[PDB]
C-alpha cells in the first residue's frame, strides 16, 4: 500500500531501548534506520486505517530540525520506520553525560527545536510528546526533532472510539494534559509548555521538580496547578529575556502561552543582544 | 529479633547459602526463565552457576548519571543488613550493560498480585496473615532501619510454598526512588492522600497502602472508585482523575454483611484520610482482627499451593 513496507525488506538490528510508545532498535533499509516495534500489535481495523492517514501527514514533511519518517511494516509486527541519527539526544548531554555546551550553543539548541515545532505547527501537526528524550544533536550541530505525531499508536481502541491515556514521563506534561478533563487535551499549547521545560533544562541543567521523588505527587499536584518548575534554578548566565519567555511557555492557563513563531522570533531576538 | 525456632532457623541458612555467593558477574549467570516485569524493571529466575543457586534478577534501565548510578549501587548494598523472616531475602546488586541488577531470594508462589489474579479474590483468613506478616516486616524494617517502605502494594508482597509472606521493592535507596520517579507512569495508585499533597507522616502512609491493598485483595478489584451498584452484586478512570478521587473523596471500605466487622473496622482504620488520626503499627498489632487473626490456624502454604496449581 501507500507508503507501506513490505514483509522482509527491513534489516532488524541490534535492540536500543524502551521508551513511552514502543521499542527502538538498529537496522537497514536503503541505508541505517531506527526501527520502532510498537506497543499496539494487534490493531482495531478503523485504528490501522487513521494510522496509515497519520503516516500519509507525516510522510509529507521535511524539514532541517526533523527526523525523516519513512514509512512503516505491518509483519511481523506493527513498526515504524525512521531516520536514524547518530550522536546522542538532548536528554543524555544535560543529564547522563552532562556535556558543558556555553549558552550562546544552548539558545542556538533552544532556536533550531523552535524552528523545528514551528513548521510542524504551520504543516498543523501535534507533537504531543516533546521532550529532550525527542530531540537529538546530528553531528553536534543540527537540531532534530523525532516521534511526532502518532496519536492513532500512542492510545489503544475498541472500535472507533479511541482511549486516551497518559504515557512515558510526566515532567513535560502541561496541567490540561495530565488532567484529561478537557475535551481535547492536546494542542499546539501542550506542545508549547513542553518546550517550556525544555527551556527549563537548557536553562538549569536540571530536570524540574528536582527535589520530588515521588511521581504521583507530581500528577497530582501539577494538574491540581499546586506545583510549578521553580524558575530560581535558572543559572545566572541565563538571559532574562530567556527566562521570561520560559515562564510564558509554562504559564498554567492553556489560552496564555504563545504559540511558536512568537517564541521563534523571541529567541532570535536574544540571541543578537549577547556577550 | 523476635523469631521461633523455624524462623531462625531459615535465616541462618539462607545466610551460609550466601556464603557461597561472591562477586557477583553478569557471566555468573544462566538465565532460566521469566518471572514479571513493570513500569521500570524485568525480573528473570536464573541461575547462579558458581554456587548453583537460584535467584530472582531485577534489572532496570536508568538513563542517569553515572555518579547517581554508583551512588545507588553502594546505597543498595545496606540490603545485605536486612534481615527478616517479613523481608525477601538480597544476594547482591551490580551494574552491567547500561543496567541495574538487584538480585534476590526466588519466591515461587510470585507476588500476591499475581496470586490475586490466579484466585479472583483472597479469604479474608488469609490476609489476616497476610496483614500479620505485612505489619511486622514494616515494623522491622522502622525499627532496625529507619526505612519506611515507601511502595506497599500487591505487587510487592511476595510469597512461597514454604508458607512465607515477605515484603519487597521498598525504598532503601533515595537516588533510586528519585530516579524511578523521572520516568514511566503507571495506571492505578496506592499512594496515600498526604503524600499525593506533601510531607509523608512517617510509616502511616505504608500503612494506608496496605489498607488499599487489603482491600483490592478482598473484592478482586482494586477499589478506587468504589462499584457504583451494578459492579458490586458480582461476588477505565485516568490516573489524575484516580488521584483526585483519593485525595477529595471518602475512603475506600469493605462491602458489609460479607466480611467480619472487625476486619472491616482494621482496613478503616488503616484507610483515614488524617495521617494522625490513622492507626500506626502499635495500634494495629493488637487490634481486635490482629489478635484473631493470629489465634487462627490457617494452612497458607497449602492454600497458595493450591490457588497456584503447585505441589507441596
Ligand atoms: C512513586 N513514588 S515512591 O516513593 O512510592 N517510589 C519508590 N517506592 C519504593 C522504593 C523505591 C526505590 C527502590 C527500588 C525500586 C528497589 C527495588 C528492589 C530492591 O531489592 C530488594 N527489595 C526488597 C528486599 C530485598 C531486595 F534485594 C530494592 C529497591 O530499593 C529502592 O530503594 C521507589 F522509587
Ligand atoms: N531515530 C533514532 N535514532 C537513534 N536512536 C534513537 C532514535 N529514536 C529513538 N532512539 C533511542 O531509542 C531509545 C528509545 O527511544 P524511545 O522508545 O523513543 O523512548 P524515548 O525517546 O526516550 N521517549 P518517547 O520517544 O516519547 O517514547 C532511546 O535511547 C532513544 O535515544
Ligand atoms: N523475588 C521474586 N521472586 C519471584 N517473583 C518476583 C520476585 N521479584 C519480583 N517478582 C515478580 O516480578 C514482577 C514484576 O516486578 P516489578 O518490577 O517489581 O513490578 P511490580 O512490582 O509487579 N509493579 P511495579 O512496582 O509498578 O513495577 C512482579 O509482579 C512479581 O510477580
Ligand atoms: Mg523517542
Ligand atoms: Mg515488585
Excluded at chain 2, 553515572?66 to 543498595?76: D, G, K, M, T, W
Excluded at chain 2, 508462589?109 to 506478616?133: C, H, M, T, Y
Excluded at chain 2, 509472606?165 to 535507596?173: A, R, T
Excluded at chain 2, 457504583?228 to 488521584?243: C, G, N, V
Aim: aromatic share 8%.
Amino acid at each position: 500500500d501507500d507508503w507501506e513496507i513490505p514483509d522482509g525488506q527491513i534489516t532488524v538490528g541490534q535492540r536500543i531501548g524502551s521508551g513511552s510508545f514502543g521499542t527502538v532498535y538498529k537496522g537497514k533499509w536503503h541505508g541505517d534506520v531506527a526501527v520502532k516495534m510498537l506497543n499496539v500489535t494487534a490493531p482495531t481495523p478503523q485504528q490501522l486505517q487513521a494510522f496509515k492517514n497519520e503516516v500519509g501527514v507525516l510522510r509529507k514533511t521535511r524539514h532541517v530540525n526533523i527526523l525523516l519518517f519513512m514509512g512503516y511494516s505491518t509483519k511481523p509486527q506493527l513498526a515504524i520506520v525512521t531516520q536514524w541519527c547518530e550522536g546522542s539526544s538532548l536528554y543524555h548531554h544535560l543529564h547522563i553525560i552532562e556535556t558543558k555546551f556555553e549558552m550562546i550553543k544552548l539558545i542556538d539548541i533552544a532556536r533550531q527545536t523552535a524552528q523545528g515545532m514551528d513548521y510542524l505547527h504551520a504543516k498543523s501537526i501535534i507533537h504531543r510528546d516533546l521532550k529532550s528524550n525527542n530531540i537529538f544533536l546530528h553531528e553536534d550541530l543540527t537540531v532534530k526533532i523525532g516521534d511526532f505525531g502518532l496519536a492513532t499508536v500512542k492510545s489503544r481502541w475498541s472500535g472507533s472510539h479511541q482511549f486516551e491515556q497518559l504515557s512515558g514521563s510526566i515532567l513535560w506534561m502541561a496541567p490540561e494534559v495530565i488532567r484529561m478533563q478537557d475535551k481535547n487535551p492536546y494542542s499546539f499549547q501542550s506542545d508549547v509548555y513542553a518546550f517550556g521545560i525544555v527551556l527549563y533544562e537548557l536553562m538549569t541543567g536540571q530536570l524540574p521538580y528536582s527535589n520530588i521523588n515521588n511521581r504521583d505527587q507530581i500528577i497530582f499536584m501539577v494538574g491540581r496547578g499546586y506545583l510549578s518548575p521553580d524558575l530560581s534554578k535558572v543559572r545566572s548566565n541565563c538571559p532574562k529575556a530567556m527566562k521570561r519567555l520560559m515562564a510564558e511557555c509554562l504559564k498554567k492557563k492553556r489560552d496564555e502561552r504563545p504559540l511558536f513563531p512568537q517564541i521563534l522570533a523571541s529567541i532570535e531576538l536574544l540571541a543578537r543582544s549577547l556577550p | 529479633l523476635e523469631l521461633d525456632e523455624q524462623q531462625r532457623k531459615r535465616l541462618e541458612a539462607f545466610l551460609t547459602q550466601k556464603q557461597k555467593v561472591g562477586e557477583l558477574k553478569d557471566d555468573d549467570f544462566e538465565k532460566i526463565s521469566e518471572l514479571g516485569a513493570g513500569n521500570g524493571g524485568v525480573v528473570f529466575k536464573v541461575s547462579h552457576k558458581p554456587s548453583g543457586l537460584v535467584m530472582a534478577r531485577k534489572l532496570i534501565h536508568l538513563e542517569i548519571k553515572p555518579a547517581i548510578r554508583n551512588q545507588i549501587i553502594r546505597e543498595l548494598q545496606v540490603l545485605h543488613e536486612c534481615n527478616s523472616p517479613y523481608i525477601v531475602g538480597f544476594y547482591g546488586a551490580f551494574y552491567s550493560d547500561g543496567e541495574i541488577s538487584i538480585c534476590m531470594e526466588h519466591m515461587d508462589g510470585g507476588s500476591l498480585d499475581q496470586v490475586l489474579k490466579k484466585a479472583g479474590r483472597i479469604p479474608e483468613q488469609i490476609l489476616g496473615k497476610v496483614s500479620i506478616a505485612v505489619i511486622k516486616g514494616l515494623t522491622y524494617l522502622r525499627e532496625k532501619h529507619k526505612i519506611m517502605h515507601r511502595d506497599v502494594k500487591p505487587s510487592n508482597i511476595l510469597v512461597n510454598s514454604r508458607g512465607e509472606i515477605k515484603l519487597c521493592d521498598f525504598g532503601v535507596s533515595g537516588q533510586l526512588i528519585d530516579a524511578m520517579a523521572n520516568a514511566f507512569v503507571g495506571t492505578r495508585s496506592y499512594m496515600s492522600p498526604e503524600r499525593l499533597q506533601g510531607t509523608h507522616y512517617s510509616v502511616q502512609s505504608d500503612i494506608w497502602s496496605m489498607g488499599l491493598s487489603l482491600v483490592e485483595m478482598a473484592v478482586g478489584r482494586y477499589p478506587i472508585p468504589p462499584p457504583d451498584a451494578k459492579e458490586l452484586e458480582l461476588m477505565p478512570m485516568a490516573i489524575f482523575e484516580l488521584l483526585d478521587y483519593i485525595v477529595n473523596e471518602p475512603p475506600p471500605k469493605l462491602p458489609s454483611g460479607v466480611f467480619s466487622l472487625e476486619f472491616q473496622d482494621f482496613v478503616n482504620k488503616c484507610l483515614i484520610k488524617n495521617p494522625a488520626e490513622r492507626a500506626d503499627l502499635k495500634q494495629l498489632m493488637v487490634h481486635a482482627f490482629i489478635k484473631r487473626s493470629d489465634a487462627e490456624e490457617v494452612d497458607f502454604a497449602g492454600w497458595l499451593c493450591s490457588t497456584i496449581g503447585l505441589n507441596q
